[PDB]
């Protein structure tokens, strides 16, 4: 119930031991003439010291040093060539060795293990086994503080074993480090590079599924290159190993159990370094911060899942104090069982960059039951709160999954929830940015307070009712989406949607129209558009499209494709700025455009080197089918404010401001404009008599002079401009006269 912290800074600083009977050997003649002889080094020179036995209650074998397990052994060679081996030193009880062996290589395994424990006398001594050799080479099986025999008898307290190398301390593929409940390692050589399955927390007994099990190894001195290959964390219970390492720690494939932590310690900045009985001084730790160059490089994450049903999950966690925290091309696994697994890739004072993608139970997409939530949970510089969390690999979830994210600044490179849905996509706990590349969504519960999205799908969810994409905080001031792209819904029903909570502005640059799709603009009050506006099939749309907003505010060169198949419904002002809403008839009807408020519409002289007019401010393409002396409703409003950027026209004047736009409004004809025709030469004046369907001009181009540098309107043609209608009178396509009237100027702002 301590956490390991607290046993770690309890079991760092100890006195030794007090023991009695310091037993001495020094390795004599022979040993230091020999350089390639392959001793054995029990039975040669360890076993003058160390007796066998017999444990009357759950014994295999039994060891310990010289009249029972409080007498310590000194091995002395210093000087001693060759290569010594173990290999066979089984349930070693015994207490405080120490094989000092410069210049000679060691060997812990040839065909048999090794193990060392210890016994819960009433004064809980550890055995603080060292070692002090050139290479190490551990080569088969070492177990610390194992379980002796079967359960009964004595049992078993804290250890500490301790590997010192000068060259390497390496390992064979079949040498399962396996260490327990109070077991430690000390490693202090370069170039540590366990090859085998190291073990942090076992079951050391053979029922107890509630041990606290903590576990410690610590490769602070490895002046080298620390290089773990398959480590696995927990067995059958909730462990909570640590390895407090040494600023560069690449790993192979971690296991962790389903409610098994790990503490990976980087160094810090600098690195490290009767009668009253007073006790010393016991230091202890609190989670501090890494230096700048420290690494963590695992490579593959997985979890094995199986077993029980409890009220949550079991939440599987590791935490880091590094500066960076890479996760390799292998990903992250997650196997879930009938509760929702749940894992905690915590990082206190660094940063995540995770490259591969997100599995569950060993695929991309892994489905889940509805109870089985697996929650994916990551955590970026939570003290300092300055700890970015970039995805650089595409994610993909399933169903019922929930990514959550609570760093500095998430980055993305795409989420696509379009398959599973019921995703809570958290991410509250991001404090300003989550720049998400490409997201695609079904029914998913996004919590972002600031983004910008710069591309986002919006699947349908088939046929089922009561879900959609769903905002569910405050969008804020700085958001952005650089294209919305909806698609295509089912069959006359709205399965999937979008709706927002809050927020005041969206900044959105592009969007389709869909379908059987809407866009719930709740609450928002400055829906913005800068550039084109049309549907998904841009040439033949169809259905119902529930656009339904609150407001909006459309910026320069913006197009709009309005349509009768969206029913673009605004409560709001509508603010029109230089942009070109265009329109279609789909049958000669016109759909108008209800303004719930306010359609102010603010332009200039928007004089282009296209025409040499002003640009068309709104159009209605395919007007021929348009019934003719009747009233065409273009917009329903209720106030509509004109102005430009200074007081008067073309320049600066003292021209009302209603009268002129009548002029920059367009009805499209004939791939040209039956409203008026601005002409500049010969050749228009064919397409012209096209649009206004008269031959009077076609054959004779320059027999008529008032159009060189002149314009003229269609007479015949009415649109209304007062302050609360916009509306079309189609009621005749006349020939213009020559010097009769109708005609005006170039508007020649040059």
């Not at 060679?77 to 405080?96: E, I, P, Q």
């Not at 593929?173 to 202090?188: F, H, M, P, R, V």
């Not at 970026?380 to 300055?386: E, F, L, P, Q």
């Not at 720049?435 to 799908?457: G, Q």
Request: glycine share 10%.
């Amino acid at each position: 119930l301590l956490g390991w912290g607290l046993k770690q800074a309890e079991e760092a600083n100890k006195t030794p031991d007090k023991p009695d009977k310091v037993w001495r050997i020094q390795a004599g003649k022979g040993f230091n003439e020999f350089p390639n002889k392959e001793y054995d080094l029990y039975k040669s020179l360890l076993s003058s010291k160390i007796d066998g036995g017999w444990d009357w209650g759950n014994a295999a074998t039994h060891y310990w040093i010289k009249g029972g397990q409080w007498n310590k052994l000194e091995v002395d060679m210093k000087d001693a060539v060759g290569t010594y081996k173990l290999s066979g030193l089984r349930n070693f009880t015994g207490g405080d060795l120490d094989v000092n062996m410069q210049k000679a290589t060691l060997r812990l395994g040839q065909f048999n293990g090794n193990s060392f424990t210890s016994y819960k006398d009433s004064a809980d001594r550890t055995t603080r086994v060292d070692f002090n050799a050139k290479n190490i080479l551990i080569d088969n099986f070492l177990e610390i503080n194992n379980r002796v025999g079967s359960g009964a008898g004595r049992k078993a307290s804290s250890t500490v074993l301790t590997l010192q190398a000068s060259e390497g301390i390496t390992s064979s593929k079949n040498a399962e480090i396996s260490l327990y409940d109070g077991a430690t390692l000390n490693l202090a050589s370069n170039s540590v590079k366990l090859n085998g399955n190291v073990w942090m927390g076992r079951l050391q007994y053979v029922g107890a599924y509630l041990a606290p099990s903590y576990s410690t190894i610590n490769t602070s001195k490895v002046t080298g290159e620390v290089n773990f290959n398959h480590l696995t964390v927990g067995d059958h219970n909730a462990a909570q190993a640590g390895i407090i390492a040494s600023n560069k720690t690449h790993i192979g494939t971690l296991d962790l159990w389903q409610s098994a932590g790990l503490n990976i310690i980087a160094p810090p900045e600098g690195g490290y370094k009767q009668k009253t009985e007073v006790q010393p001084t016991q230091v202890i730790d609190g989670p501090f911060a890494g230096g700048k160059d420290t690494v963590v490089n695992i490579d593959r994450i997985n979890t094995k899942a199986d077993g029980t049903i409890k009220v949550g999950g079991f939440k599987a966690s590791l935490t880091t104090n590094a500066a960076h925290l890479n996760i390799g091309k292998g990903g992250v696994n997650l196997s879930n069982q009938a509760s929702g697994r749940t894992l905690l890739v915590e990082n206190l004072t660094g940063n995540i960059t995770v490259d591969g993608p997100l599995r569950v139970n060993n695929q991309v997409g892994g489905y889940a039951l509805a109870g089985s939530s697996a929650n994916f949970e990551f955590k970026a510089g939570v003290d300092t709160k300055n700890g970015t969390a970039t995805f650089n690999n595409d994610i993909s979830l399933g169903r019922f999954v929930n990514l959550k994210v609570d760093a500095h600044t998430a980055n993305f490179k795409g989420i696509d929830t379009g398959n599973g849905g019921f995703n809570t996509l958290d991410f509250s706990g991001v404090t300003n940015k989550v720049n998400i590349n490409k997201l695609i969504t079904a029914s998913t519960n996004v919590a972002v307070k600031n983004f910008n999205i710069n591309e986002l799908i919006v699947k349908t969810n088939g046929v089922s009712v009561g879900e959609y994409t769903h905002f569910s905080e405050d969008i804020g001031s700085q958001s952005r989406i650089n294209t919305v792209r909806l698609e295509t819904g089912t069959r006359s029903i709205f399965s999937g949607g979008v709706k927002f909570k809050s927020g005041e502005k969206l900044v959105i640059d592009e969007f389709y129209y869909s379908p059987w799709n809407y866009f719930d603009a709740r609450n928002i009050k400055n829906v913005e558009i800068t550039r084109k506006f049309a549907s998904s099939t841009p040439e033949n749309p169809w259905g119902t499209s529930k656009l339904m907003f609150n407001n909006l505010t459309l910026g320069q060169n913006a197009v709009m494709d309005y349509s009768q198949f969206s029913n673009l419904t605004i409560q709001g002002d509508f603010i029109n700025n230089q942009g070109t809403i265009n329109y279609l008839v789909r049958g000669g009807k016109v759909a108008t455009l209800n303004v719930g408020n306010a359609a102010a519409m603010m332009f200039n002289n928007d004089i282009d080197s296209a025409t040499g007019f002003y640009k068309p401010l709104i159009k209605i393409n395919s007007a021929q089918d348009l019934i003719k002396n009747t009233e065409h409703v273009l917009l329903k409003a209720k106030i509509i404010g004109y102005g430009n950027v200074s007081t008067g026209t073309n320049g600066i004047s003292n021209v009302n401001l209603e009268e002129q736009f009548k002029e920059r409004l367009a009805l499209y004809n004939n791939n040209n404009r039956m409203d008026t025709c601005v002409v500049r030469n010969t050749d228009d004046i064919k397409a012209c008599g096209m649009a206004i369907g008269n031959q009077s001009m076609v054959n004779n181009p320059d027999n008529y002079k008032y159009l060189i540098g002149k314009a003229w309107k269609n007479i015949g043609i009415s649109k209304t401009a007062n302050g609360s209608k916009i509306s079309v009178y189609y009621l005749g396509n006349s020939t213009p006269t020559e010097n009769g009237g109708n005609t005006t100027n170039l508007p020649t702002n040059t």
